[PDB]
Amino acid sequence: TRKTYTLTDYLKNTYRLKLYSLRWISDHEYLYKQENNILVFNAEYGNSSVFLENSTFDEFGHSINDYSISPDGQFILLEYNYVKQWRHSYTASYDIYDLNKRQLITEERIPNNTQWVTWSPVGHKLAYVWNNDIYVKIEPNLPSYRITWTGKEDIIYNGITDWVYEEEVFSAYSALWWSPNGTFLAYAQFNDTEVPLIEYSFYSDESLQYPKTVRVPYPKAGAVNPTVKFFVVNTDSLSSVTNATSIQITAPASMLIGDHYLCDVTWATQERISLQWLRRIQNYSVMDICDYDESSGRWNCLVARQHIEMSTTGWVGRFRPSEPHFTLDGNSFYKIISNEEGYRHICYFQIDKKDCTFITKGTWEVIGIEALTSDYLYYISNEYKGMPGGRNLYKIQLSDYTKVTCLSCELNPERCQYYSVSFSKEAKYYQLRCSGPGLPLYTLHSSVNDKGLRVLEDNSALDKMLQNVQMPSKKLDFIILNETKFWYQMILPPHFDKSKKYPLLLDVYAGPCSQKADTVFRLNWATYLASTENIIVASFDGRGSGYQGDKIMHAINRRLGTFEVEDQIEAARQFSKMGFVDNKRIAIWGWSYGGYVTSMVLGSGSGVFKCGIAVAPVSRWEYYDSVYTERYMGLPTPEDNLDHYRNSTVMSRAENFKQVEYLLIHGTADDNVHFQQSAQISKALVDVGVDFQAMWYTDEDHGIASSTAHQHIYTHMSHFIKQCFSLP
Amino acid sequence: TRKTYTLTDYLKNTYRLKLYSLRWISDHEYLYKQENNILVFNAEYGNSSVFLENSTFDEFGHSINDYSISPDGQFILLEYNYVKQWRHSYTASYDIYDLNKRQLITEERIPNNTQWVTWSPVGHKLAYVWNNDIYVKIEPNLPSYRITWTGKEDIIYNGITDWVYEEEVFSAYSALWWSPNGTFLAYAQFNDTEVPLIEYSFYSDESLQYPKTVRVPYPKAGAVNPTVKFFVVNTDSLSSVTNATSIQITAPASMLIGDHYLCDVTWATQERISLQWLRRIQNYSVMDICDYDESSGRWNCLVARQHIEMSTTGWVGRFRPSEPHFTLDGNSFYKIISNEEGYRHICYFQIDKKDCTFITKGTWEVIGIEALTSDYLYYISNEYKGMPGGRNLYKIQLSDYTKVTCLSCELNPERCQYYSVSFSKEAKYYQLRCSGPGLPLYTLHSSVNDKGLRVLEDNSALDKMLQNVQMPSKKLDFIILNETKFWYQMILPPHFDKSKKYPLLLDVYAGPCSQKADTVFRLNWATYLASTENIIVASFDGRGSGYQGDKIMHAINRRLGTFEVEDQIEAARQFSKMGFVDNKRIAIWGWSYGGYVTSMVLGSGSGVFKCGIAVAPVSRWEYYDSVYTERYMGLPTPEDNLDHYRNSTVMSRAENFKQVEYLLIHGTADDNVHFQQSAQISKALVDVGVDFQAMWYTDEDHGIASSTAHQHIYTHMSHFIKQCFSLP
Ligand SMILES: N[C@H]1C[C@@H](N2CCn3c(nnc3C(F)(F)F)C2)CC[C@@H]1c1cc(F)c(F)cc1F
Ligand SMILES: N[C@H]1C[C@@H](N2CCn3c(nnc3C(F)(F)F)C2)CC[C@@H]1c1cc(F)c(F)cc1F
Ligand SMILES: *[C@@H]1O[C@H](CO)[C@@H](O[C@@H]2O[C@H](CO)[C@@H](O)[C@H](O)[C@H]2NC(C)=O)[C@H](O)[C@H]1NC(C)=O
Ligand SMILES: *[C@@H]1O[C@H](CO)[C@@H](O[C@@H]2O[C@H](CO)[C@@H](O)[C@H](O)[C@H]2NC(C)=O)[C@H](O)[C@H]1NC(C)=O
Ligand SMILES: *[C@@H]1O[C@H](CO)[C@@H](O[C@@H]2O[C@H](CO)[C@@H](O)[C@H](O)[C@H]2NC(C)=O)[C@H](O)[C@H]1NC(C)=O
Ligand SMILES: *[C@@H]1O[C@H](CO)[C@@H](O[C@@H]2O[C@H](CO)[C@@H](O)[C@H](O)[C@H]2NC(C)=O)[C@H](O)[C@H]1NC(C)=O
Ligand SMILES: *[C@@H]1O[C@H](CO)[C@@H](O[C@@H]2O[C@H](CO)[C@@H](O)[C@H](O)[C@H]2NC(C)=O)[C@H](O)[C@H]1NC(C)=O
Ligand SMILES: *[C@@H]1O[C@H](CO)[C@@H](O[C@@H]2O[C@H](CO)[C@@H](O)[C@H](O)[C@H]2NC(C)=O)[C@H](O)[C@H]1NC(C)=O
Ligand SMILES: *[C@@H]1O[C@H](CO)[C@@H](O[C@H]2O[C@H](CO)[C@@H](O)[C@H](O)[C@H]2NC(C)=O)[C@H](O)[C@H]1NC(C)=O
Ligand SMILES: *[C@@H]1O[C@H](CO)[C@@H](O[C@H]2O[C@H](CO)[C@@H](O)[C@H](O)[C@H]2NC(C)=O)[C@H](O)[C@H]1NC(C)=O
Ligand SMILES: *[C@H]1O[C@H](CO)[C@@H](O[C@@H]2O[C@H](CO)[C@@H](O)[C@H](O)[C@H]2NC(C)=O)[C@H](O)[C@H]1NC(C)=O
Ligand SMILES: *[C@@H]1O[C@H](CO)[C@@H](O)[C@H](O)[C@H]1NC(C)=O
Ligand SMILES: *[C@@H]1O[C@H](CO)[C@@H](O)[C@H](O)[C@H]1NC(C)=O
Ligand SMILES: *[C@@H]1O[C@H](CO)[C@@H](O)[C@H](O)[C@H]1NC(C)=O
Ligand SMILES: *[C@@H]1O[C@H](CO)[C@@H](O)[C@H](O)[C@H]1NC(C)=O
Ligand SMILES: *[C@@H]1O[C@H](CO)[C@@H](O)[C@H](O)[C@H]1NC(C)=O
Ligand SMILES: *[C@@H]1O[C@H](CO)[C@@H](O)[C@H](O)[C@H]1NC(C)=O
Ligand code: NA
C-alpha cells in the first residue's frame, strides 16, 4: 500500500517542486544558477559557460543573499546582510565587483543601511536611496552625487515608498525610474508628516529586557493620507553643475482639487514620460504625457495628450489603473481597460486622440501585455475554452487584428493550462512557464518561428517520487446561479467515492478580484488534508471575484462583507446537494481577507458550518488602510458610506458564534492587518460569553512565514480540524 | 440527589458570604453601612442611631463610590467618578458635605481627577494630591495651600507613589503621613526621571481607530530605580501670601552611599517621627528616629537613636522591614523581627539603646502586632496547636512576659481557627473576624475582661442554603521531607471514598513567604472542581513558604525557580502514591508567581503531570520589577547573580513541554507581569516545535477581573481541565 501525502511531507518539503528561474541579460543570453555557479546560456543552441565560479566569493566573509549584473555586463552588485521589512521592502549591505578586473571595489562603497539600489537601464550608472535621500554614482568607484536633502525617517521619503504606497499602490519599495538610456532619473517624494502612526510591541530575542515599540506611518480608512510630488533630474549633468536641479512635474488641476495618488510612472521615450494620477475616490484617473523642452529644461504635458479613465460601476483597474505599453516612437500605446460590456481588453491609443480602439474583445479577459514588437503584441488571457481560471499566451498581428495566434493552448493541453512567460531583451526568445494542472513544465522557444527549442525543466524527478504516493485529485467546474456561471475547485481524496459522505473544508479568500478556482498545481496543506485525512477541500469564486468581467467583480462595490460572504455560504449548500458531503462535517477557513469572510460566515447564523479558522483577519474596515479599503468602500463618513462600514464588522455578529467552534490566530507583529483587529474580535466574543480557541504568534507578521511559526500554525490548525471532524 | 456547587454558582456568586465591615470612630462607637444608610453603633450595648440617611443624596446626580467621614464627625467626603489605575491607585472627584449645616460645600472644592485625599487624623483638615502636587485645606470651604510645585506626570511624584513603590514598597498610592494631631504633614517625593518605561498597546472600545500606547515608568531587574526624598511641613503655619516651607530629612550615610529605598514612615509622637531606609541589596535596613527642634524649626535624627536591622540568610522582613509600634510617650517601641532561631517574634526597643529584648519566642511566628496599651500588647500568631496555617489573637502582659493569654483559641475551636481583629481607638473594644475552617463569624468583645458581648454576623443564612448542596471538605495535614514537615491541603469531593482513584489538580502559588495551606473557608473555582467534577484540588507549602521561620523561607534566597519548584513536584509525587489518587490524571495550575512555578514544573521533565495551566506567569526574572525581584535574586550582573537569573527561565525548558498539555493565558494590558513574559514563552515553544493551547485577554491586566473576562477565563480553564481528565 502506497503512503499518503502527510503533514510532515508538506512541512518538511520532502516532495520538492523544481523550477527554472533564468535572467535574460540580452536578446539571446540568460543567466541561470546551477550548483552555486552562475552559468550563462546561449538561448539558440543551449550551450553554456561559467559566468561566475561558485568559489569566487568563498572568502568574501559574508553570505551573499542575491546578485545583480549591470546592463553592460561590466559589474555585478552583491547583496548581503539581507534584512526583510514589509512585503517588498528590505535592508541590506552591498558591494560591487568589477567583472573585468576581477577585483572587488573597496572605495566609495555603497553605504550600509542602503534602502534601495538600482542600475541604470543601460551601462553601469547606479542610483540608491540612503537615509531617505537619493544618490547617483556615474561610476562604481567614484563619489556619489546627492540628489535630495529633505529625506527624514518616517516623514519624507525620496525615491522609496512609505508603507501604504509600497503595499497598495506600487507593489514595490522603489519610487524611482530611470529613463530608457539612463539620461534622466525620475522619482517620487512622499510626505507623511500628518499620517497617523500604528504602534505595536516587538519582543525580539529573549535577551531584550524592554519590548520595543514599532511605529509606522499608516493611514487607516478615512485618515490623513501621505501627499506626493514628482520630479525628474538630468543625471548627465551631475558632473557639470554643483547641484543638479530636480524639475517638478505637477499633478493636473483635476487632481489638485483634493486628495489624490500618483499611481503609475512609465517612460515612453528618451524624452517623454507618462504619469497616471488617481483621486482619493478611486473611480477617476488621469494620465499626463510629458515632453522634455530642451530650451527651457522643463517638462510640459499638453492637455491634448491627457487621457481620462473612470468607472461608473466600481473602481478603476483590477487593483490600480493599468500600465501603458508604448510603441517604439512613443506616439501610441496599448492599455488594458474594460470595454462597454465590462470585460478587460487591449485598447490602442494615439497619444493625442482621446478615443482608443479595442483590439481584442469577447466574454473573457486579457490578464496582461507581455511584449510589444514592431509587428506583434503578446498577451496572456483566459480566453481558451472559456476557462476564467486558465492562462495562455497569444500573439496578435499589429497590421491585421483578425490574426491572433495562441502560442501555448495546444502545446500539452492535458498537462498545461496555466502559463506565464518571460521574453528575452528584444523578444527574440521566450520561456514558457506552465504551472498546472499537471506538474510545472518550463520550455524555451524562438519568436522568429514560434518553434520549441527545448525543455528546460519537466519535473521528471518529482513525478517519479509521486508515483509511490496516493495523491489527491483536483476538480475544476462551475455551478449556475441566477443564469450566471460561478467556478469552484475541489481537492478530492485518493480513490474518491461519490457514494460516500466526506467531511468538507471550504478554503476561502474571496476578496475583490480574487480567484481561488484555477488550473494551478499545488502541493500544500489541502494536499495533506485530502490525501491523508480524506477531507475534501473546496474553494469558490462568487460575486466580487476577478477575471470574469465587471458585472461580477464590481458586484461588491461599496458593499464588502455581503455578497462575497453570502455566496460562500450558498456554495457550501450547493456542495451539500452534490451528495458526497457529510452535512454534519462542513468547516471553513481563510487567511487575511479570507479570515474576515470566514469570520463573517461563522457569525452569520446560517447553521451550515460546524467550525472555522480565521488567520490574521480584518474585523472592521476602519482598521485597515485607506488606499485598499476606500477603493471598494469609499469614505467612512455619514455623507459617504459610514453606515455600511459600521454594519460590516465581525464584532457585531459575536452572539452568533455561540453556534460554532472557532479558532482565531494572529501574529503580534502584523504591520498589515494589525493585531488590533483580532484583539477586538476576541474582546467582543468575551463580552457576550462565547468560548473559542485562540493562538497568537510572537513577532510574526501578516505572513506568519518564519520556518518554525509556519510549521507550528499548520500543526495547530490540523489538530483543530481533525478534532472538529472527529478524526483520529 | 441534592445539587452540587456548580461553575455557574461560582461565577454568578449564588452563595455569598456575609461580612460585617465596621469603622471605629472612637473608643466606644463604630460606623456600619446598612441598607445604604450609615448607622452609628455603641459597642457596649449594641444600640444604634442613623448617622446619615441613604436618601440624603438622592438628587446628588453622581453615583457615590465611597465616603469618608472626618474624625470629628462634622464633615463627610464623597467619592465619585472613580477611575482605577494600578493595584491601589485610582483618581476620582470629591465633594464635601457639612453634616451640621446639612449642606454640600460649593466653594473651593477639591479638583476633579484628584489622585489621593485624606482627612487629618484629628479634626477636619484635608490633604490631597492633584497633578502630582500636594495641597492642604485647613477648612473644607476655604482655599487650599499649594505645598509642592515640582509635580510632573511620570517624572516627579509628591505625596503619591510611582508604580514600583505602590506595588512593592508601600502597598498604597499614598505617600502622605499626618502627625498624630494634624500639626505636621510628612511626605515623600519620588523622581523617576531616568526610569525606563514599559510600553504596551491598549485597544479600548471598538470605536478607537488607532490603538493607544500606554507608557509606564517601570524599573525591571537591574534597571535605573526611582530616587526618593523625604519632607515634613508644618500645616499650622501656612500662609496665603508666602509659599510653604518643607523641611527635608535626609537618609543616613550608610544609605546615601548607593541606591536605596524609603520603606516605612511611622509617627511616634506629636514631634517625633521614625523612618526606615533599605539598601538596594535588601538585607540591610536602617531606622532613624527624628525629633522636632522648636528652636531651629528643623528635624534632627540622633545617631544614638539609629537602629540597624540586617539578615545574613536572606532579605529583611517578610516582604519588607516590619513597622514599629511606639508607646504613648514614644520613648520605646515594639517590632517584629527574626530572632536567632530565624522565627519572627516581637522585640522591645528603647529608642536610644542598641539591644532590643524579645518578648515572645518559640517555633511559630507572630503575624502582626494589633494593639498596644500600657498593660498589654495584642497580637496575632500561628502558635495555637503548632498549626502555621491557623491564626489567633493573644495578649501579653507587659510586666511579665510569661503571662500570655490566647483570646480566640477556645471561642469555637471547630469552626474557628483563623482570626483577624479590629480594635477600637484605645483598645477598649475589639471585633474578631473568624474566616475558617467553618463559615465566617464576626463577634464584638470588650478588653477589660475579654467579654464576648455579641455576635454581629454568623452567616446562618448561608449555612441554611449550603445544607441543600453537596459541599466538598478540606483536609489540612503535612508530609515530612528531610526531618522537616511541610503542610498541604486538599479540597476533597463530596462523599470522598478512599477506595476510589480521583484525578488531582495541584493549585500552586509558592512565591517567597506564600501560604497556600491554611484553615480558611473559601468558595472558589476549586470548590466547583471538587463538588461538581469530583477532582481533588491540593496545594502545598514547600521551601520558600512563610510563617514557619527563615530556615524554610530563606531556602530560596538568590535561588528562585529551584527548591520551591522541586518541592511541588515532590509533593505531587507523594500524593500520586496515595491510594485515592489517579497517577495518570494529575495536573497543575497557578497564576502570577504560581504561573511561573507551574511552567517550571511542566518543563522539568518529571513526567508526573499530564497537563497544566499558567495564567500571567513570570518567565524570566529580568523581565520583572527591581524591588521585588532583586529582594530575592540580588542583581543580574556577572559579579552578583546573573548566572542564576539566566538559568531560572521558563524558555530554557521549552523542549521538556513535548510530553504535556499546556495552556498559556495572559491579559494584553498587564502592567505588572508584562504580556512580554508570555510572548517569550510561546515563541520558545514555537521554536522547538511544541504544540500548546493559548488565550490572550484583550485589555485585561494582571487580575483579569472584569466581569466578562473572569467568567470567560474560568469557563475556558474548566473545559481544558475536564478534557485533560476525560471528564464528561
Ligand atoms: N493589501 C493587499 C495587496 C494585494 N496586492 C495585489 C497586487 N499585488 C500584490 N503584490 N504584488 C502585486 C502586483 F504585482 F500584482 F501588483 C498584492 C494583495 C492582498 C493584500 C491584502 C488585502 C486585505 F484585504 C487584507 F486584509 C490584507 C492584505 F494583505
Ligand atoms: N508584586 C507582588 C506584591 C505582593 N504583595 C504582598 C503584600 N501586600 C500586597 N498588597 N498588600 C500587601 C500588604 F498589605 F499585605 F502589605 C501584595 C503580592 C505578590 C505580587 C506579585 C509577585 C510576583 F512574583 C509576580 F509575578 C506578580 C505579582 F503581582
Ligand atoms: C555557445 O556555442 C557557440 C558556438 O557553438 C559559441 O560561439 C563562438 O563563436 C565564436 C565566434 O568568434 C567562435 O570563435 C567560437 O569557436 C564559438 N564557440 C564554439 C563552441 O563554437 C558561444 O561562445 C557559446 N556560448 C556560451 C555561453 O558558451
Ligand atoms: C511635508 O508636509 C508638511 C505639512 O504637513 C510641511 O510642513 C509645514 O512646512 C511649513 C513650511 O515650512 C511650515 O510653515 C508648517 O509649520 C509645517 N507644518 C507641519 C505640520 O509641520 C513640510 O514642509 C513638508 N515637507 C516637504 C519636504 O515638502
Ligand atoms: C541643492 O539644491 C537644493 C534645492 O535648491 C537645496 O535644497 C534647499 O536647501 C535650502 C537651504 O539648505 C532650503 O531652504 C530649501 O528648502 C531646500 N530645498 C529643497 C527642495 O530641498 C540643497 O540644499 C542644495 N544642496 C547643496 C549642497 O547646496
Ligand atoms: C539619451 O537620450 C538623451 C535625450 O534624448 C540624449 O541627450 C540629448 O542628446 C542630444 C544629441 O543627440 C543633445 O543635443 C541634447 O542636448 C541631449 N539632451 C539631454 C536632455 O541631455 C542622450 O545623448 C542619449 N544617450 C545616449 C547614450 O544615446
Ligand atoms: C499638636 O502638637 C503640636 C506640637 O507639640 C502642638 O503645637 C505646639 O503647641 C505649643 C503649645 O501651644 C507651642 O508652644 C508650640 O510652639 C507648638 N509647636 C509647633 C511645632 O507648632 C499643637 O498645639 C498640637 N495640636 C493640637 C490640636 O493639640
Ligand atoms: C547582603 O547580601 C550581599 C549579597 O549576597 C552580601 O554581599 C556580598 O555578596 C557577594 C556575592 O554577591 C559575596 O561574594 C560576598 O561575600 C558578600 N559579602 C560582602 C561583604 O560583599 C552581603 O554580605 C550581605 N550583607 C549581610 C549583612 O549579610
Ligand atoms: C445607645 O444607648 C445610650 C443609652 O441607652 C444612648 O444614650 C446616651 O447618649 C444619648 C445621646 O447620644 C443621651 O440622650 C443619653 O442621655 C446617653 N445616656 C448615657 C447613659 O450616657 C446613646 O446615645 C446610644 N447610642 C447610639 C449610637 O444610639
Ligand atoms: C530628578 O532627578 C534628575 C536626575 O535623575 C535631576 O536632574 C539631574 O539629571 C539631569 C539628567 O537626568 C541632569 O541634566 C541635571 O543636571 C541633574 N540635575 C538637575 C537639577 O537637573 C532632576 O533635577 C530631579 N528633579 C527634582 C525635582 O529633584
Ligand atoms: C471638575 O470637573 C467638573 C465637570 O466638568 C466641573 O463641573 C462643572 O460642570 C459643569 C457641567 O457639568 C460645567 O459647566 C463647568 O464648566 C464645570 N466647572 C464649573 C466650575 O462649573 C468642576 O467644576 C471641576 N472642578 C474643579 C475643581 O475644577
Ligand atoms: C560549485 O559549488 C558546489 C557547492 O555548492 C559544488 O558542489 C560544485 O561541484 C561546484 N561546481 C562545480 C562545476 O564543480
Ligand atoms: C558596514 O558596517 C559594518 C559594521 O560596522 C562594517 O564592518 C563595514 O566596514 C561597513 N561597510 C561599509 C561599506 O560601510
Ligand atoms: C465616483 O464615486 C462617487 C461615489 O460613489 C460618485 O458619487 C461619483 O459620481 C463617481 N464618479 C464617477 C465618474 O463615476
Ligand atoms: C435606602 O435605599 C434603599 C435602596 O437602595 C432602600 O431599600 C431602603 O429602604 C432605604 N433606607 C431606608 C431607611 O428606608
Ligand atoms: C511659589 O513658588 C512658585 C514656584 O517656584 C512660584 O511660581 C510662585 O510665584 C511662588 N509664589 C509665591 C507667593 O512666592
Ligand atoms: C535535606 O532535604 C532537602 C530538601 O528538604 C534536600 O535538598 C537536601 O539535599 C537534604 N540533605 C541536606 C544535607 O540538606
Ligand atoms: Na455575649
UniProtKB/Swiss-Prot annotation, chains A, B:
- What does changing residue 712 to E do? Inhibits strongly homodimerization, dipeptidyl peptidase activity, interaction with CARD11 and T-cell costimulation activity
- Modification after translation (UniProt): The soluble form (Dipeptidyl peptidase 4 soluble form also named SDPP) derives from the membrane form (Dipeptidyl peptidase 4 membrane form also named MDPP) by proteolytic processing.
So what does mutating residue 191 to A actually do? Does not inhibit dipeptidyl peptidase activity, interaction with ADA and homodimer formation
User: Which residues get glycosylated?
Assistant: 47, 54, 112, 181, 191, 243, 283, 482, 647
From which lineage does this chain's organism come? Eukaryota, Metazoa, Chordata, Craniata, Vertebrata
Output the InterPro entries linked to this UniProt entry. AB_hydrolase_fold (IPR029058), Pept_S9_AS (IPR002471), Peptidase_S9_cat (IPR001375), Peptidase_S9B_N (IPR002469), Serine_Prot_S9B/DPPIV (IPR050278)
| Record's note on what induces expression | Up-regulated by IL12/interleukin-12 on activated T-cells. IL12-activated cells expressed enhanced levels of DPP4 but not mRNAs. Down-regulated by TNF. Up-regulated in migratory endothelial cells and in the invasive endothelial cells in tumors. Induced by hypoxia.
Cystine pairs: 290-301, 347-356, 406-409, 416-434, 611-724
User: In the UniProt record, does the keyword Transmembrane occur?
Assistant: yes
Outline what the protein does.
Cell surface glycoprotein receptor involved in the costimulatory signal essential for T-cell receptor (TCR)-mediated T-cell activation. Acts as a positive regulator of T-cell coactivation, by binding at least ADA, CAV1, IGF2R, and PTPRC. Its binding to CAV1 and CARD11 induces T-cell proliferation and NF-kappa-B activation in a T-cell receptor/CD3-dependent manner. Its interaction with ADA also regulates lymphocyte-epithelial cell adhesion.
Tell me the active site: 592, 670, 702
Tell me more from the record: Level of plasma concentrations of the soluble form (SDPP) can be managed as a colon carcinoma diagnostic and prognostic marker.
Q: Tell me, what is an example of a GO biological process annotation in this record?
A: receptor-mediated virion attachment to host cell
About its domains, the entry says: The extracellular cysteine-rich region is necessary for association with collagen, dimer formation and optimal dipeptidyl peptidase activity.
**Consequence of mutating residue 167 to K?**
Inhibits dipeptidyl peptidase activity
Residues assigned to the Extracellular compartment are 2-728
Species whose genome carries this gene = Homo sapiens (Human)
Per its record, the protein catalyses: Release of an N-terminal dipeptide, Xaa-Yaa-|-Zaa-, from a polypeptide, preferentially when Yaa is Pro, provided Zaa is neither Pro nor hydroxyproline
GO CC annotation: apical plasma membrane; cell surface; endocytic vesicle; extracellular exosome; extracellular region; focal adhesion; intercellular canaliculus; lamellipodium
Gene behind the chain:
DPP4
Outcome of substituting residue 482 to A: Does not inhibit dipeptidyl peptidase activity, interaction with ADA and homodimer formation
| UniProt subunit comment | Monomer. Homodimer. Heterodimer with Seprase (FAP). Requires homodimerization for optimal dipeptidyl peptidase activity and T-cell costimulation. Found in a membrane raft complex, at least composed of BCL10, CARD11, DPP4 and IKBKB. Associates with collagen. Interacts with PTPRC; the interaction is enhanced in an interleukin-12-dependent manner in activated lymphocytes. Interacts (via extracellular domain) with ADA; does not inhibit its dipeptidyl peptidase activity. Interacts with CAV1 (via the N-terminus); the interaction is direct. (Microbial infection) Interacts with MERS coronavirus/MERS-CoV spike protein.
Which EC class does it fall in? hydrolase
Which protein family is named in the record? Belongs to the peptidase S9B family. DPPIV subfamily.
What name does this protein carry?
A: Dipeptidyl peptidase 4
- EC no. given is 3.4.14.5
